[PDB]
Amino acid sequence: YSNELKELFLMNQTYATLFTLTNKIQIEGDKYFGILTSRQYMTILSILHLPEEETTLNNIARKMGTSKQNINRLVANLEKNGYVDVIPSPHDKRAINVKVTDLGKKVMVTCSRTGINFMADVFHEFTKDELETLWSLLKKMYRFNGEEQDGFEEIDKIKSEALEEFAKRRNRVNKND
Amino acid sequence: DYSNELKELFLMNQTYATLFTLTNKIQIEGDKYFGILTSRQYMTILSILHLPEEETTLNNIARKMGTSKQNINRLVANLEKNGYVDVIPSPHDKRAINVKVTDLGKKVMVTCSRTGINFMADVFHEFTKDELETLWSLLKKMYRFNGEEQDGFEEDANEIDKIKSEALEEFAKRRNRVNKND
Numbered sequence: 001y002s003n004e005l006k007e008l009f010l011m012n013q014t015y016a017t018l019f020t021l022t023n024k025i026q027i028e029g030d031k032y033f034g035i036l037t038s039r040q041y042m043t044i045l046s047i048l049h050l051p052e053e054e055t056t057l058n059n060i061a062r063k064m065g066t067s068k069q070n071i072n073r074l075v076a077n078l079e080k081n082g083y084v085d086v087i088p089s090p091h092d093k094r095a096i097n098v099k100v101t102d103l104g105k106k107v108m109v110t111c112s113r114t115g116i117n118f119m120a121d122v123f124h125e126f127t128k129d130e131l132e133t134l135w136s137l138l139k140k141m142y143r144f145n146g147e148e149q150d151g152f153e154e155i156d157k158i159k160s161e162a163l164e165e166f167a168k169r170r171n172r173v174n175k176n177d
Numbered sequence: 178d179y180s181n182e183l184k185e186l187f188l189m190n191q192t193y194a195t196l197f198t199l200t201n202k203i204q205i206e207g208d209k210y211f212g213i214l215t216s217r218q219y220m221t222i223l224s225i226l227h228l229p230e231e232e233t234t235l236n237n238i239a240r241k242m243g244t245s246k247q248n249i250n251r252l253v254a255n256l257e258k259n260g261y262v263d264v265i266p267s268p269h270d271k272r273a274i275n276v277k278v279t280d281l282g283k284k285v286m287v288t289c290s291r292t293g294i295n296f297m298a299d300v301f302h303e304f305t306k307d308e309l310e311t312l313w314s315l316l317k318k319m320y321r322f323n324g325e326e327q328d329g330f331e332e333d334a335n336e337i338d339k340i341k342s343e344a345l346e347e348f349a350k351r352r353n354r355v356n357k358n359d
C-alpha cells in the first residue's frame with residue numbers, strides 16, 4: 001500500500017497548505033485593504049459583477065462559492081455600514097436585490113488601488129506560466145463534485161501611476177541598499 | 178504600453194478570485210463530509226496535535242494555522258465549550274496557555290480522520306500525482322510572498338493493520354472512480 005500512502009500524504013499536505021495559505025492571504029489582505037476585510041471586498045465586487053436584477057442571495061452565494069446563509073450575514077453587515085442598499089427583488093417576492101451605494105463605491109475605489117499593490121506582492125515570484133498553471137489546477141479542484149466555477153468598463157478606469165507602481169513592486173526593479 | 182501589465186494584473190486577479198471561492202467551496206464541502214465537526218474545528222485540533230504539549234500556545238497554533246491569535250482564541254473557546262479541549266496555564270510563561278485534546282476530542286478526530294481519507298480521494302480524483310506535486314509547490318511559493326515560509330505538517334512522512342488496509346483499499350477505489358458503473 002505504499003503508493004496509496006504516498007498519494008494520501010501528498011493529498012493531506014496539499015489540502016493543509018491550501019487551508020493555511022488562504023488563512024494567511026485573508027489576514028494579509030485585510031492589512032493591505034485596511035478599511036474593508038477581504039471578505040467584504042470580494043462580496044461587493046461580486047455584486048458589482050452581477051446585473052442589478054440578478055443580485056439575489058442565491059446568485060451572490062454561487063459566485064462566491066459559499067452558502068446563502070453566509071452571504072445573508074455578510075450583506076446585512078454591508079448594509080448597516082451603509083455600503084449597500086437592499087431592496088425587494090422585482091421578479092420574485094421571496095428574493096432580494098443589492099445596490100452598492102456612493103459610500104460603497106468610494107471605499108471600493110480606495111481598496112482596488114491597494115488591491116493592485118497586493119497582487120504585485122503576492123505573485124512577485126511567479127512567472128505568467130506558473131500563474132496560468134496555478135489558476136488551472138485550482139479550477140480543476142473546484143469541480144471535484146461535478147459543479148464548475150462561476151468566475152469574475154474596468155480596463156479604462158486603471159490609471160497609469162497604479163500600473164507603474166505595480167510594475168515596480170512585481171519586478172523588484174529597485175536596487176536595494 | 179501597459180498592455181502586458183494589465184494582462185498580468187488580470188491573471189493575478191482571476192487566480193486570487195479562484196483561490197478564494199475554491200476554499201469557500203472546500204470548506205462547505207468538508208463540513209458536509211465530516212458532519213460532526215466543521216473543517217476549521219478539525220484543522221485546529223490537528224494543529225494542536227502536531228505541536229508538543231508544552232508549546233501549544235495561541236501564538237504557536239496561530240502560526241501553524243496561518244492565522245491570527247484572536248481567531249485562534251475564538252476557535253479554542255468554541256472547542257472548550259464543546260468539551261473537545263481543556264485549557265490550562267502554560268508552565269513556561271504566566272501569560273501564555275497550553276491546550277490539551279480530551280478523550281472526547283480524540284474520539285471525534287478518529288471518526289473525522291476516517292471520513293477525511295474519503296474526502297481526499299474525492300477532492301483529488303482527477304489529479305495525477307504530478308499535478309498534486311505541482312499544485313502543492315505553487316501553493317508553498319504563494320505562501321512565502323512576504324519572506325515567511327510555511328510551518329507545515331510535513332513531519333507526517335518520517336504499522337498497516339487490517340483496519341488501515343481497508344481504509345486504504347476504499348481510498349484507492351474512490352479515487353479511481355470504479356462507480357458511475359450502472
Ligand code: NA
Nearest residue numbers: 045112115190
Ligand atoms: Na478588481
